[PDB]
Structures are given as C-alpha cells and as structure tokens.
C-alpha cells in the first residue's frame, strides 16, 4: 500500500510519500510512474522483508 | 500615587517614565525564522496510530 506523507503544490521535489512494502526476497527494484502527473526523482530502491 | 491607581497592574519608576508590564491588548507579532533550522519532512519519524 502507498501512503502520502507531505506534498507541496510546487515545482521542486516537495512531495514525499511512504510505501508499505510487502516483499519476499531482497534485491533492487526500479520505480517509475507511467502517468505524467507526478515525477519521481528516486530511481532505485532495495527491498527488505516487509 | 499613580503607582497604585493605574489599572492593568502597571508599574512606574525613576526613569524616562516608562509604564512597565501594563498587561493590556494584543500584539501582532510576525516572525521570519531562519531556513537553516528546518529539517526535511521525510527524515523525521512517522508517529501515526497513536
């Protein structure tokens, strides 16, 4: 599940959010939003167990 | 003496004739804090479910 933390209606990366990951193994994971509504500066996140 | 009839608990002294601590009214305070003391929202812990 995805939870917003604090979004700023601005031009810089003011939007932040926390994702409650529910994974099984550990490894890299690319992140991307296909929609053009939001742009994510973060590129890669390693996944731990939940 | 005016030192004992002044309302709002004023106080006077051998001075430029100030009236110390005349508690009355409100003050429109506006303050610009330094930006350095701010810390990113994404770094502070989340304290939900309290």
Curated annotation (Swiss-Prot), chain B:
Subcellular location: Virion membrane; Host cell membrane
Annotated S-S bridges: 10-22
PTM entry text: N-glycosylated.
Membrane topology according to the record: Single-pass type I membrane protein
Domain of life of the source: Viruses
Subunit structure: The precursor of protein E3/E2 and E1 form a heterodimer shortly after synthesis. Processing of the precursor of protein E3/E2 into E2 and E3 results in a heterodimer of the spike glycoproteins E2 and E1. Spike at virion surface are constituted of three E2-E1 heterodimers. After target cell attachment and endocytosis, E1 change conformation to form homotrimers. Interacts with 6K protein.
Function summary: Class II viral fusion protein. Fusion activity is inactive as long as E1 is bound to E2 in mature virion. After virus attachment to target cell and endocytosis, acidification of the endosome would induce dissociation of E1/E2 heterodimer and concomitant trimerization of the E1 subunits. This E1 trimer is fusion active, and promotes release of viral nucleocapsid in cytoplasm after endosome and viral membrane fusion. Efficient fusion requires the presence of cholesterol and sphingolipid in the target membrane.
Name used for this protein in its record: Spike glycoprotein E1
Source species: Eastern equine encephalitis virus (strain Florida 91-469) (EEEV)
